[PDB]
Design a protein around this ligand. Sequence first.
Ligand code: LHG
Ligand code: LHG
Ligand code: LHG
Ligand code: LHG
Ligand code: LHG
Ligand code: LHG
Ligand code: LHG
Ligand code: LHG
Ligand code: LHG
Ligand code: LHG
Ligand code: LHG
Ligand code: LHG
Ligand code: LHG
Lengths: 63, 63, 63, 63, 63, 63, 63, 63, 63, 63, 63, 63, 63, 63, 63, 63, 63, 63, 63
Amino acid sequence: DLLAGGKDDVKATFGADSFVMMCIIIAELIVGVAMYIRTKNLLILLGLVVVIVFTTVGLTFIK
Amino acid sequence: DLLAGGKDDVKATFGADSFVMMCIIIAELIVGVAMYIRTKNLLILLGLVVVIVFTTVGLTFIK
Amino acid sequence: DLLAGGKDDVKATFGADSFVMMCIIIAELIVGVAMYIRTKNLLILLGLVVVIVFTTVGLTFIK
Amino acid sequence: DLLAGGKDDVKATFGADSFVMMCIIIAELIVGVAMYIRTKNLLILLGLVVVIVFTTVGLTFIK
Amino acid sequence: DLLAGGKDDVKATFGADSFVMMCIIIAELIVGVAMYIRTKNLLILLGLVVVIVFTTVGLTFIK
Amino acid sequence: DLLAGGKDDVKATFGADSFVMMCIIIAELIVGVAMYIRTKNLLILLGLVVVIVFTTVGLTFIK
Amino acid sequence: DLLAGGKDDVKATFGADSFVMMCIIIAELIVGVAMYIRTKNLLILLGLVVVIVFTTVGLTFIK
Amino acid sequence: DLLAGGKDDVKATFGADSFVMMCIIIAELIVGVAMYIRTKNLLILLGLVVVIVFTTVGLTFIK
Amino acid sequence: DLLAGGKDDVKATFGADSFVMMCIIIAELIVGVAMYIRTKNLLILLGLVVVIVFTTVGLTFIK
Amino acid sequence: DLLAGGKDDVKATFGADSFVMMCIIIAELIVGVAMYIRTKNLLILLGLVVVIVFTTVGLTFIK
Amino acid sequence: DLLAGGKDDVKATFGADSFVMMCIIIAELIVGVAMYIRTKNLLILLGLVVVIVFTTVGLTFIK
Amino acid sequence: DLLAGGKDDVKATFGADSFVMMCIIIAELIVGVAMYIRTKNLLILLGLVVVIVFTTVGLTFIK
Amino acid sequence: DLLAGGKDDVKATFGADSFVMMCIIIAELIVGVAMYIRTKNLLILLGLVVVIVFTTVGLTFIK
Amino acid sequence: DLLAGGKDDVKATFGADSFVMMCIIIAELIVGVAMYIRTKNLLILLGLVVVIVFTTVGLTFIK
Amino acid sequence: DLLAGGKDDVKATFGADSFVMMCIIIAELIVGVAMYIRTKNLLILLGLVVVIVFTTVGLTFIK
Amino acid sequence: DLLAGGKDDVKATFGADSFVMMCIIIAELIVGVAMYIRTKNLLILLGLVVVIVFTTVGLTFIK
Amino acid sequence: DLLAGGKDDVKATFGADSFVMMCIIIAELIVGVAMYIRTKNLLILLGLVVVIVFTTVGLTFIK
Amino acid sequence: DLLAGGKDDVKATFGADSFVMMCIIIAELIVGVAMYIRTKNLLILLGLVVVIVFTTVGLTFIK
Amino acid sequence: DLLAGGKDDVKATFGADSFVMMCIIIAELIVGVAMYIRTKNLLILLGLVVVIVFTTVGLTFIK
Ligand SMILES: CCCCCCCCCCCCCCCC(=O)OC[C@H](COP(=O)(O)OC[C@@H](O)CO)OC(=O)CCCCCCCCCCCCCCC
Ligand SMILES: CCCCCCCCCCCCCCCC(=O)OC[C@H](COP(=O)(O)OC[C@@H](O)CO)OC(=O)CCCCCCCCCCCCCCC
Ligand SMILES: CCCCCCCCCCCCCCCC(=O)OC[C@H](COP(=O)(O)OC[C@@H](O)CO)OC(=O)CCCCCCCCCCCCCCC
Ligand SMILES: CCCCCCCCCCCCCCCC(=O)OC[C@H](COP(=O)(O)OC[C@@H](O)CO)OC(=O)CCCCCCCCCCCCCCC
Ligand SMILES: CCCCCCCCCCCCCCCC(=O)OC[C@H](COP(=O)(O)OC[C@@H](O)CO)OC(=O)CCCCCCCCCCCCCCC
Ligand SMILES: CCCCCCCCCCCCCCCC(=O)OC[C@H](COP(=O)(O)OC[C@@H](O)CO)OC(=O)CCCCCCCCCCCCCCC
Ligand SMILES: CCCCCCCCCCCCCCCC(=O)OC[C@H](COP(=O)(O)OC[C@@H](O)CO)OC(=O)CCCCCCCCCCCCCCC
Ligand SMILES: CCCCCCCCCCCCCCCC(=O)OC[C@H](COP(=O)(O)OC[C@@H](O)CO)OC(=O)CCCCCCCCCCCCCCC
Ligand SMILES: CCCCCCCCCCCCCCCC(=O)OC[C@H](COP(=O)(O)OC[C@@H](O)CO)OC(=O)CCCCCCCCCCCCCCC
Ligand SMILES: CCCCCCCCCCCCCCCC(=O)OC[C@H](COP(=O)(O)OC[C@@H](O)CO)OC(=O)CCCCCCCCCCCCCCC
Ligand SMILES: CCCCCCCCCCCCCCCC(=O)OC[C@H](COP(=O)(O)OC[C@@H](O)CO)OC(=O)CCCCCCCCCCCCCCC
Ligand SMILES: CCCCCCCCCCCCCCCC(=O)OC[C@H](COP(=O)(O)OC[C@@H](O)CO)OC(=O)CCCCCCCCCCCCCCC
Ligand SMILES: CCCCCCCCCCCCCCCC(=O)OC[C@H](COP(=O)(O)OC[C@@H](O)CO)OC(=O)CCCCCCCCCCCCCCC
């Protein structure tokens, strides 16, 4: 059988609605605008979108 | 014959559905996004994929 | 003649299908991914392959 | 003349095919992989080769 | 039967609400900010989170 | 029951209004401006903000 | 209660009218003109303004 | 004579049709397209060709 | 006269057609392609050639 | 006069054509290529040359 | 007068052309190359020179 | 009651105006300039300030 | 009272007109020009000025 | 009084007419022309002038 | 007095008629024509003149 | 007199017609063409000429 | 008077025409060309000149 | 009065013109050039000058 | 009263002008230069100064 195996709730800690998933997404926003202002090209504002989908489709592979 | 040879269930502890295999994959996600935001190039988001397959095809060599 | 010479089954303990050969290979996997995530270069995932062959071709020299 | 001089079979005990020569070579393998995993440089896997030849060409000097 | 087996209250000493669990968590905070200021990268502020969960899910394995 | 468990006032020593919390925040200011002047990019002045919130929301997890 | 808690006058040492706040502002001026002369663009002369306000509104968060 | 000399099948492990020769060629493809898209010049798509021939004419020097 | 002087066959172990000379050349190939893909400049593929000649003209100095 | 003075043949043991002079030169070759592959700069392949001359002109000072 | 005073030939035993002066110089050579190969910096090959002169100018102080 | 308790004048020996407090502050100056010249960054000249205040506010906790 | 307290003349040794204060200032000059020539930017020639004032206003805090 | 205080002639060693002041000025000339030829802009030939005055007005602060 | 002060002949080595002053002037000629041919504007041929006078009037400041 | 002084033939090893002088010149050729092709400017093909003369006029200073 | 004072001929060993002064100058040549080829800038070929004069004017200070 | 007080000639042994003062200065030269060649920056050749003056002005403090 | 109390002249033996105070200061010089040459940083040459003052101000506390 499995040991240490536990709980999982660790998943709920890092999961969909979380504190860490909430700060990791807000940093993408705030330094996304930063690296935009210093440059002014737009692929970087789109760089926020790839974090939205990545975390979303990423978290479903945890199970 | 073999000694110490045991159980194996140690395999079930580190195996496919596990606690340690669940945290080792979630760290790839969370520091994958990190090293992405500080840079914004995409091979690193793909760095999560190589952990998916590596652990998958790796665990089958244990036997 | 030989003394102490025994059994060998000690070979079966450390041999091909074993408990110690099973844990020594699983550590290569789990710290292989570790040193990968902290860096993200791939020669290290290949570092698992050299343990596969080394133990394999190594054990045949015991005899 | 010689005294205590004996048998030799002591040579057969520590000689080519032996129990002690079998364990002294298997330790080189198992701690060779160890010090490899903790580091990942390859001269150490080659450290097994120098034990192969050393014991081989060493035992022939006993006579 | 068991000897020395006691009390446990030792568990209550090192357990959830404790003095030692209170200082071991506050050191993570104060040297977390330290190693942040000297560097200014953020995975380290997240290093406090992994101590929160580790002690939490760790203490439940004592029993 | 608990032992060593004490006082807490240790919390009041490292808590919200404190001497150590007062110096750890003032160092962020003074080396924040330093690493700004030597570079002149602004995410670093914002590096003071993340220490404000981190200590604030951090101290509430002590209990 | 609080320990070590002291004096504060440490605040008066690093505070509004101070020696260190006087040198940290004068360095912004002298290397501000430097990086201006070697380049001749003006956002950098404005880089002195952001140090004026930052220290000003920063020091009020110490309390 | 030769010692340790073995098998070779190690050659078959890293040889023409292999697992490692299969992944080392597929990485050239996937990061070849990457460094192409970020730039859009074509010598890099040709960079896949030089890996085809190099491994091919390289493996024949092993013997 | 000479002592310990032996055999040589140690030379045949590390000599022209060998196991160790076979692996030391195959590593040049596999990490040669690696450091090529991560960069894509060609002097490194030529780095395999200098190992071919070096071992070749090197082994003849052993005698 | 001299005592213990002997033979010399010890010189023939460590001298020009020897077993130890044969292994000490072959290690320079095999770890020379090693530290080359991990780096790929060439002063190290030249590091074999300085062992050739050093042992050569060194042994003549023994007398 | 002097007693025990002897012979000297002890000087001839440890003197210029000797057995012990011959082995003490040959060890400098063989472990000089050793500590060179493991490192590859050259002050150590020069470490043989300082033994040449030291023994030479040292032995003349015996009288 | 207290024993050994003494005098204090030991405090006057290590106190505000002292010989040891005079040398411990002058070393900060002289190796402060040293580590500055070898580098030329200025947080280190400020390293003298933190010794001024530390000893000052430190000595008042002795009582 | 104070012990060990002495003389001070140690102050006169490291003080304003001294031998050590004379060499510590002359090194700033000679390696100031060095790091200038290898680069040719001028903030470094100004690096001599900050040593002039630092030692000057530093020595007055000794008392 | 002062100790170690000496001579000064150290000043005459590094002073106006000296050997080190003669080589430190001649290097400015020879690498001044170098960095000129590789570029061909003239502020760098003027870089020799700032070494003339700097050493001149610098040496007078030694006293 | 002065130490290390020597000879000067170092001046004669880098002086008016020298080997290094002869090569530093000939490089100005040969890369002067180069950067001319690739462009064909004439201020660059005049760039040789400024090296003639600079070294000439430069060398007289050595004394 | 001189010690260790030897032979010279070390000079003949690194001298005019040599193995090392033959490889050090051939590397200039092969990486000279390399850095030419990746760029296509010609001062670099001339970079081979400066190695011809440098080794030539350099070797004559050995004596 | 002086003791140990000897001979000097140690000076003749390391002096003007010597074996060690002959190898220390030839290394400057061979790694001078090396660091030139890998870069192709010329101040480094001039790096041989500063070893010529340094040893020359250095050896005269031994007396 | 004084005992053991002797001679001094020990001073003449380690003094100005000596054997040990002659070797301690020649090592500065030979490893000065070494650490120069491996790097090629010049403050290190100047490192010989600071040994000249240090021993000179140092020996005068012995009395 | 006092016994054993003597002479003092023991003070004159270890005092200001002495044999032991003369050798203890000369060792600081000779191993000061040693640890300098092996490193080449200058706080260590200053390590001689702290022995000058320490013995000086130390000896006055004997009385
Ligand atoms: C788990 C699945 C992982 C799959 C990840 C796929 C990555 C493959 C890389 C493709 C080529 C790399 C292009 C380099 C990047 C490149 O050349 O552009 C560079 C661009 C940012 O520009 P830079 O500031 O780096 O400056 C470079 C510019 O000069 C070039 O325009 O990258 C971005 O961050 C913009 C993103 C927009 C592009 C959106 C693409 C769609 C992405 C979707 C994948 C979502 C992941 C979900 C997974 C959970
Ligand atoms: C057990 C089997 C082990 C086989 C492992 C194969 C490794 C061979 C190495 C090939 C060349 C190395 C390239 C260096 C890496 C390199 O140059 O890219 C660098 C890139 C990350 O970029 P960095 O942040 O390091 O910055 C470098 C950039 O400037 C270059 O674009 O590496 C990644 O992590 C991205 C991965 C995408 C590439 C996917 C390749 C497909 C992999 C599949 C293997 C799965 C393993 C399964 C095993 C269980
Ligand atoms: C019993 C037989 C023993 C033979 C062992 C052969 C070892 C000879 C060493 C060759 C050169 C050393 C290279 C240094 C290593 C080096 O430079 O790369 C370094 C690399 C890991 O990279 P690091 O994290 O150390 O960082 C260094 C990087 O910056 C360099 O890319 O080493 C690995 O672990 C990757 C392995 C892939 C390479 C595969 C080679 C094929 C191996 C096959 C041998 C199997 C053994 C079977 C025996 C049972
Ligand atoms: C009891 C269960 C134990 C399971 C523990 C799982 C550990 C497996 C290791 C995975 C890969 C290692 C990554 C190296 C670390 C690495 O590469 O990053 C390095 C990073 C800190 O950065 P450094 O200052 O070390 O500098 C390195 C940087 O340059 C790299 O960005 O590590 C941290 O402390 C940040 C943590 C954020 C990452 C969060 C991951 C989620 C963790 C959850 C596990 C909670 C434990 C609960 C147990 C009670
Ligand atoms: C405590 C509160 C902290 C809040 C800090 C806010 C920072 C958020 C960053 C915004 C975008 C980053 C822009 C990058 C910077 C950027 O792209 O410009 C770059 C510019 C200097 O130019 P560089 O020499 O770096 O060269 C880049 C140029 O090519 C671009 O023009 O930055 C400056 O130092 C000029 C400052 C003028 C801009 C004034 C903005 C107003 C600031 C007010 C905040 C005062 C702080 C008070 C706190 C006490
Ligand atoms: C074992 C045999 C080894 C021989 C290897 C030969 C290498 C000699 C180097 C020649 C000059 C170097 C050019 C620098 C490279 C250079 O300047 O181009 C640069 C180019 C990639 O461009 P980058 O992204 O580096 O950007 C630079 C650009 O601005 C220049 O266009 O290199 C490539 O990867 C493209 C390859 C196409 C060129 C194909 C050539 C044919 C190759 C055939 C050899 C096959 C090897 C088989 C061996 C098994
Ligand atoms: C036993 C005999 C030993 C002789 C060895 C000779 C070494 C002398 C060094 C010459 C200058 C050093 C150049 C630095 C290297 C340098 O600057 O290039 C650097 C280059 C690799 O480039 P990296 O990745 O290091 O990046 C640097 C690049 O930006 C420069 O293009 O080195 C290589 O591995 C390519 C090799 C092609 C060059 C082939 C030369 C011919 C070699 C033949 C010798 C065979 C040895 C046989 C002995 C058994
Ligand atoms: C018995 C006589 C002893 C004389 C020995 C002479 C040693 C004097 C040291 C000179 C300067 C030291 C240079 C540091 C070394 C240095 O800076 O290079 C470093 C280089 C290896 O590079 P590393 O891997 O250490 O990395 C450093 C690199 O970044 C620098 O390129 O050293 C080598 O092993 C290459 C050897 C080629 C150089 C050949 C020189 C000719 C030698 C001939 C002497 C033969 C001895 C015969 C005696 C029997
Ligand atoms: C002890 C007193 C110290 C006072 C030092 C004063 C330094 C203050 C810095 C002012 C602005 C910095 C300009 C950056 C430098 C800059 O932007 O120019 C850059 C220029 C060299 O050009 P680069 O090769 O660095 O390339 C940058 C170019 O693209 C810009 O044209 O600097 C020089 O070396 C030329 C010097 C001519 C300028 C002469 C100025 C007068 C100097 C007089 C001071 C004598 C010192 C005597 C003290 C003993
Ligand atoms: C020791 C005394 C040092 C004094 C040095 C004086 C430098 C002051 C700089 C003046 C303005 C800079 C002009 C930038 C340069 C500039 O704008 O022109 C640029 C020009 C070369 O053109 P480029 O290839 O750089 O392309 C830029 C073109 O598009 C502009 O036409 O510079 C040259 O090398 C030509 C020199 C002819 C000009 C001769 C002037 C007379 C010089 C005499 C000084 C002799 C020194 C003797 C000292 C020993
Ligand atoms: C032992 C004697 C040592 C004397 C060495 C003399 C070096 C003095 C440096 C002069 C100015 C430096 C120019 C920087 C170099 C520079 O600006 O050009 C750069 C050029 C190569 O161009 P890069 O690829 O570095 O790119 C820079 C380009 O954009 C500039 O065109 O250098 C070369 O390798 C070409 C060599 C042709 C020039 C030939 C000159 C004649 C040389 C003769 C000396 C022979 C030595 C014999 C000694 C044994
Ligand atoms: C015993 C007397 C000691 C006096 C030594 C004098 C050293 C003073 C340092 C001056 C400024 C330092 C410059 C840094 C060096 C620097 O910035 O250039 C760097 C240059 C080599 O370039 P790197 O490869 O380090 O790369 C840096 C480049 O990007 C800069 O061009 O240094 C050299 O080895 C070239 C030497 C030519 C320069 C010749 C100068 C004349 C020297 C004469 C002294 C002979 C000594 C005889 C004593 C026996
Ligand atoms: C008895 C009197 C003792 C007084 C000693 C004075 C020491 C005070 C230290 C000043 C600042 C330390 C600088 C660190 C050193 C530093 O930052 O430079 C580092 C430099 C060598 O460079 P490294 O190889 O250590 O690499 C570091 C480099 O990256 C920095 O350029 O040190 C040297 O050996 C060069 C010496 C030239 C400088 C000459 C200064 C004048 C000295 C005169 C004193 C003579 C002593 C006579 C006494 C008998």
